[PDB]
């Protein structure tokens, strides 16, 4: 609960939120780059700040102005809190018919009230959720979604289209059949490739909903994000290949995304609506599950600046080792207000579940194939060692470079230096050996992601050619070296960090990963250790 990146990131999220609020209240501008650079990834924040930040994110009392919210008490159908625009929406206004402490069954029709009562007294699962009801005065058809909080029942009322109910049923059956066809097309795919799966999913999603842009974000181990697929609208600027820092999506927001699968924002420029509450209630309402919760000012400003006006984010969940893990998101962006009906969200959730299942497929199969390939390469290297001198393992192919994904390899055998690919010079590797034996003497290995942060005084003159170094202690005098270059070499996107724009996010990310290679995975270290054990035994036999 300390070494994990999420817990450290919580305090940074709280600090950035506090900085944003302070800049907003004092009539200033939220400087993205300076704020991100000033606060580090550590933790120097007391309990009160974290508690207040969590309460503000979860209990804010502000909903989007496209639907109304009413909370009641399960005991006697008594209103204990409501949104203002409800009086606008239900048509109650011209003895008060919407005053706190009233009966919520007197706001709708008799049949709607009976259906509400049947959906109210219930059990672990109820079969009327959402309900289709009609207001008492006008007759506006409303979709009512009910959920439970610690003090009562929260009802989100969203307006529906006034038409023949046959068309209402058709608008759901067609939207579900489109998702079924998309899933069926996903099934009949040549396995073994993830890129094709993502490129099919983006097109299916864009054909289903109909937004102006669809992208897939994948989260790495660092917990930052990368765009892996995109389906734009021709004249729009492409974003594929973009990398943005981890702080762009706070951990609490990631948790919320994992809780409610599909989250939709209709307009980023509309005025949020206040929610009036009771005097007896201790704390504000919990909008942690309401489908009307308004986004915080930071994300609204970001969306307004970058160009999107609407949004619809869905969660990609896989099984981690029971336990669920957020692999990434599939996000649709538009350029105007857009509010899709309710069945489309369920169809999108179905498609996302199928996508997650196939993703688990491909990940596990790829891991097994990697294990098989590593085993074959190790066996061939052992055969080469048996047939010739040890130096043979670096002379012909396959060589030690084929063991793990890297940019260079090196073998040091009794002063003899065998470099393959990009590698340091003779004196450079001599100084590397000196430092390694001076600092880490009693060890069987060392894996660092940056020779600068590790403590090597020669990393600066070493350059960007090599940044990560994995070492295997064959003996006290002979070592095995794997060298990897900096992350920015494979980072390529076709694109004064004051505003909050994707260009500024890319600049911040490139600042973050300066002089740092990709993470050393565990399987690579396992293969290195196996090779080290075999080589140690073979050389001890001699």
């Amino acid at each position: 609960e300390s070494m994990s990146k999420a817990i450290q990131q919580y305090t940074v999220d709280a600090r950035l939120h506090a900085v944003f609020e302070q800049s907003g209240e004092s009539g200033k501008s939220f400087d993205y780059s300076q704020s991100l650079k000033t606060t580090t990834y550590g933790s120097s924040v007391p309990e009160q700040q974290i508690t207040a930040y969590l309460s503000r994110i979860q209990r804010g009392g502000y909903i989007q102005p496209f639907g109304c919210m009413i909370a009641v008490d399960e005991s006697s159908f008594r209103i204990i809190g409501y949104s203002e625009n409800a009086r606008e929406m239900l048509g109650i206004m011209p003895p008060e018919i919407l005053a706190m402490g009233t009966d919520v069954r007197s706001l709708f029709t008799s049949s709607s009230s009976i259906l509400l009562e049947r959906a109210f007294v219930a059990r672990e699962i109820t079969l009327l959720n959402p309900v289709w009801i009609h207001s008492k005065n006008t007759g506006k058809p409303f979709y009512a979604i009910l959920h439970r909080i610690d003090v009562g029942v929260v009802i989100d009322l969203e307006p529906a289209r006034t038409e023949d109910p046959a068309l209402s049923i058709a608008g759901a059956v067609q939207s579900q059949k489109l998702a079924v066809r998309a899933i069926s097309q996903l099934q009949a795919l040549p396995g073994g490739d993830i890129k094709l799966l993502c490129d099919t999913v983006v097109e299916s999603v864009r054909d289903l909903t109909g937004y102006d842009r669809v992208m897939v974000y994948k989260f790495h181990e660092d917990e930052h994000g990368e765009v892996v697929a995109e389906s734009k609208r021709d004249d729009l600027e492409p974003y594929i290949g973009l990398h943005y820092p981890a702080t762009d999506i706070p951990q609490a927001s990631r948790f919320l995304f994992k809780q409610n699968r599909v989250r939709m924002i209709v307009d980023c420029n509309a005025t949020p609506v206040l929610v009036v509450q009771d005097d007896r209630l201790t704390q504000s309402m919990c909008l942690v599950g309401s489908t009307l919760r308004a986004p915080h000012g930071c994300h609204s400003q970001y969306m307004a600046n970058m160009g999107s006006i609407a949004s619809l984010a869905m969660a990609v969940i896989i099984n981690g080792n029971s336990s669920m893990r957020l692999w990434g998101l599939v996000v649709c962006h538009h350029t105007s207000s857009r509010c899709i009906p309710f069945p489309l969200r369920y169809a999108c959730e179905f498609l996302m579940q199928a996508f997650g299942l196939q993703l688990n497929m491909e990940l596990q199969l790829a891991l097994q194939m990697s294990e098989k390939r590593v085993l074959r390469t190790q066996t061939l290297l052992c055969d080469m060692l048996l047939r010739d001198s040890p130096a043979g393992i670096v002379t012909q192919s396959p060589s030690i470079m084929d063991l793990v994904k890297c940019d260079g390899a090196a073998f040091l055998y009794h002063g003899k230096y065998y470099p393959l690919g990009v590698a340091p010079s003779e004196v450079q590797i001599k100084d590397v050996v000196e430092w390694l034996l001076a600092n880490h003497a009693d060890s069987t290995g060392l894996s660092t992601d940056s020779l600068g942060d590790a403590g090597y005084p020669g990393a600066a003159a070493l350059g960007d050619a090599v940044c990560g170094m994995a070492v295997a202690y064959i003996t006290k005098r002979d070592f095995l070296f794997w060298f990897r270059s900096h992350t920015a070499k494979e980072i390529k996107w076709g694109g004064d960090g004051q505003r909050m724009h994707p260009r500024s996010s890319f600049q911040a990310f490139l600042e973050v990963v300066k002089s740092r290679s990709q993470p050393w995975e565990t399987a690579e270290m396992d293969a290195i250790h196996s090779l080290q054990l075999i080589l140690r035994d073979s050389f001890k036999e001699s």
Partner: protein
């Protein structure tokens, strides 16, 4: 092995840790099939 319904949870910060405390800690579990629930709830008798 019951279908149940989605139960929402809220993060709280207690004892120097981030724990996802649930909303309502909850008897009378379901003892009838979903078919019976459909045949009971979707009863259009009050329209006479």
């Amino acid at each position: 092995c019951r279908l149940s319904d989605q139960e929402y949870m809220e993060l709280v910060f207690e004892n120097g840790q981030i724990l996802a405390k649930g909303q309502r800690s909850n008897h009378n579990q379901r003892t009838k099939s979903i078919m019976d629930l459909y045949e009971a709830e979707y009863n259009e008798d009050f329209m006479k």
